Design a binder for these strands. Sequence first.
DNA 1: TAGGATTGCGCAATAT
DNA 2: AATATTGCGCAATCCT
Lengths: 67, 65
Amino acid sequence: DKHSDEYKIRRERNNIAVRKSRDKAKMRNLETQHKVLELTAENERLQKKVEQLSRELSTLRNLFKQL
Amino acid sequence: DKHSDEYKIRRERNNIAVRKSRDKAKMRNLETQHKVLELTAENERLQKKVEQLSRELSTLRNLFK
DNA sequence: TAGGATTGCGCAATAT
DNA sequence: AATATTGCGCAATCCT
């Protein structure tokens, strides 16, 4: 009975739930995009640290090897 | 007119476009989530590398003493 | 069995 | 013209 009164309230409740679910998912996506930005900045920081330490170590090893 | 052949083909083509558009968005969102997993693992790897390089530096510097 | 959460899809207005 | 998006909503199904 798609004309019923009860039917309409059931549909209204689901429509409310749908918007809530969609909002939540779209927010989760936005949070995830933010996480990528955050993780990328951290990845760049770590890359820089690894390079710096690698050069420091290579220089020290060369010193010992030049004895 | 919903009986119009033009209408019928209009709906058929739009339904294809709507589905395509929605699949592309779901794909983009899944990739973004994937990148989080990727970067997380990579950052973990680099951190371990940082720690390893530091141990190697310490070991060598101990030779001075 | 009830009832909210998720998901896929259609429609039609609207944008490109 | 034709395809791409998107607000609104139906219905099935998943989850409590």
